[PDB]
Design a protein around this ligand. Structure first.
Ligand SMILES: Nc1ncnc2c1ncn2[C@@H]1O[C@H](COP(=O)(O)OP(=O)(O)OP(=O)(O)O)[C@@H](O)[C@H]1O
Ligand SMILES: [Mg+2]
Ligand SMILES: [Zn+2]
Ligand SMILES: [Zn+2]
Length: 590
């Protein structure tokens, strides 16, 4: 196939169209980097899907954390339910990276249970890229992680057609030769019928363990289930059950190589050191090899990825970006945060693994199993598009100007900003607060020190006001619980240090306080401030008060931009006759 079908209730509102089409044209004109500058709540996720469909290409949308990768998922689902949309994540978004604390001389094993759901979609994701051209995969920074080679996937593939002759025990083998999927057992798996005309209940294949069970009697091919039959076929494809699978003849040789190293490493470790003389690792190396020649896989296999692949030391790893057709597209959400973090992933891995090698719990060759370097990520790009309200210096210095999109569909507008002295700052912020309770409106405050927030909360309650918390990480459960508590009348105010903590996109909030605007901090930067400001644009009377003594260069930039931004949204509601009205949202249950 290969046709994108973009469903949707609305239509391009704001200045979406200018945006969309500008990007599009720019792909086509063959440009590498483009940056989308979209304000908060102006609808980026949607604008994006439009461009996607105009270029009919397959893409990976990299988000910077589990949750986000999630929202983007479902969202993009409602947009295209007739196309391929997968969710590539990993156990980096949870467990412990088998490390070692030397001082406390305390070891920590790779304790990570296989959470099947994950694996399920990891496999559907890979597969999809060799069948259709209409695929979409949302993923974490984790996509730049080492993975089995792709070619050795489009090779160990079981192409099933009609008219060809294969034993009833011949395919049963290429089948176990790929770490069998579900051809064993709560039964006999896929054993029945027999002869030249067999049965074979090829089930649990992860690439579609959503109960599909493919049956092929003397190819045959007819999608089934745990109940009854459905949907007809004449050509199927079965995929490996591991991303790190290898061919026997190759494994045989890898093993010898592993060995030459473990040997010749103890000789160099013998001479220089005496860290348990050198050895101690022999316990698991050898224990690992024995479990290897006996069975294709083993314990921490992944560690021997470079060796198994049969590629020279230092080699750059294989990644999900290598499974995408030669001309694909990558969307990077919240790019000013993602990018930087995905940058120092190699450094932190290398750091925590070199330790295990000095202490000797894995060998040099284990270093070769790592994430990409930022340059290795670069050399792999075909064409990208960065999305963010606060684009970083990288995107701007590589991109040819930006592509502005700053008009919300409701026609709401970035607040107005005030800046007042630190003297008498509290009795002032109380007065400007009482007045919001009298108009049924909520507030949000921010400090720098957890002892300044604390110093306030009480001061506030002692003023006769329903007030919020003072503790940063108050779980996530009770956390979502008190957000709900606010947009309801429970409280009128709310103090926090970090307000950029998602969930805080509330409409009943009309005023936002920034108590140490001119101080030093990450939470007081050109980018970070603008972002805190947008928390006051979910309303028709959004205002921001900045309490300070001086006007930092950061403060300046923010204010300057918000201004300009607001002007243009206003001259626009003019030409069109729109009166800004506050968004409404329902108030569910936790
Ligand atoms: N053209 C449109 N017509 C109607 N609704 C739209 C349109 N475009 C976008 N929306 C809406 O805008 C909302 C938020 O858009 P989007 O997800 O991009 O917010 P955002 O840009 O991510 O905000 P933030 O930067 O704060 O995260 C959604 O509720 C979405 O339905
Ligand atoms: Mg977003
Ligand atoms: Zn460069
Ligand atoms: Zn218009």
């Amino acid at each position: 196939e290969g046709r994108f079908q973009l469903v949707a209730p609305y239509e391009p509102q704001g200045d979406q169209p200018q945006a969309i089409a500008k990007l599009v044209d720019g792909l086509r004109r063959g440009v590498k980097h483009q940056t989308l500058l979209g304000a908060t709540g102006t609808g980026k996720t949607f604008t994006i899907s439009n461009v996607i469909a105009q270029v009919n290409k397959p893409t990976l949308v990299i988000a910077h954390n589990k949750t986000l990768a999630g929202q983007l998922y479902s969202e993009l689902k409602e947009f295209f339910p007739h196309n391929a949309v997968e969710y590539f994540v990993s156990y980096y978004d949870y467990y412990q990276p088998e490390a070692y604390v030397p001082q406390t001389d305390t070891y920590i094993e790779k304790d990570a249970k296989i959470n099947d759901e994950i694996d399920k979609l990891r496999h559907s994701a890979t597969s999809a890229l060799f069948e259709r051209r209409d695929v979409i995969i949302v993923a974490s920074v984790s996509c730049i992680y080492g993975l089995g080679s792709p070619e050795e996937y489009r090779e160990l593939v079981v192409s099933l057609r009609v008219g060809m002759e294969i034993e009833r025990n011949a395919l049963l083998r290429r089948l176990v030769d790929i770490q069998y999927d579900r051809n064993d057992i709560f039964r006999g798996t896929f054993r029945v019928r027999g002869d030249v005309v067999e049965i074979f209940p090829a089930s649990r294949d992860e690439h579609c363990i959503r109960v599909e069970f493919f049956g092929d009697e003397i190819e045959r091919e007819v999608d089934a289930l745990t109940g009854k039959v459905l949907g007809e076929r004449e050509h199927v494809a079965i995929f490996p059950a591991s991303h790190f699978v290898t061919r026997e003849e190759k494994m045989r040789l890898a093993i010898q190589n592993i060995e030459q190293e473990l040997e010749e490493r103890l000789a160099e470790l013998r001479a220089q050191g005496k860290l348990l003389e050198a050895q101690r690792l022999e316990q698991r190396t050898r224990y690992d090899l024995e479990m290897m020649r006996e069975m294709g896989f083993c314990s921490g296999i992944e560690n021997y990825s470079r060796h198994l692949a049969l590629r020279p030391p230092g080699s750059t790893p294989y990644t999900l970006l290598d499974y995408f057709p030669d001309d694909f597209l990558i969307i990077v959400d919240e790019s000013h945060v993602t990018l930087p973090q995905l940058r120092g992933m190699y450094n932190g891995d290398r750091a925590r693994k070199q330790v295990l090698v000095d202490h000797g719990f894995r060998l040099p060759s284990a270093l070769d199993n790592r994430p990409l370097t930022f340059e290795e990520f670069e050399q792999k790009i075909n064409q990208i598009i960065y999305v963010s309200a606060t684009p970083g210096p990288y995107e701007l210095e590589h991109s040819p100007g930006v592509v502005e999109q700053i008009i919300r569909p409701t026609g709401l507008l970035d607040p107005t900003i005030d800046v007042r002295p630190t003297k008498g700052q509290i009795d002032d912020l109380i007065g400007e607060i009482r007045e919001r309770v009298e108009r049924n409106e909520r507030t949000l405050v921010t400090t720098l020190t957890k002892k300044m927030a604390e110093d306030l909360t009480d001061y506030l309650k002692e003023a006769g006001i329903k007030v919020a918390y003072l503790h940063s990480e108050i779980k996530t459960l009770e956390r979502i619980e008190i957000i709900r508590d606010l947009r309801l009348g429970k409280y009128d105010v709310l103090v926090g240090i970090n307000l950029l903590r998602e969930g805080l996109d509330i409409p009943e909030v009309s005023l936002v306080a920034i108590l140490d605007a001119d101080k030093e901090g990450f939470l007081r930067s050109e980018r970070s401030l603008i972002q805190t400001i947008g928390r006051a644009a979910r309303n028709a009377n959004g205002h921001v008060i900045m309490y300070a003594d001086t006007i930092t260069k950061s403060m300046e930039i923010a204010i300057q931009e918000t201004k300009r931004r607001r002007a243009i949204q206003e001259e626009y509601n003019r030409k069109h006759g729109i009166v800004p009205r506050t968004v409404k949202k329902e108030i569910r249950d936790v």
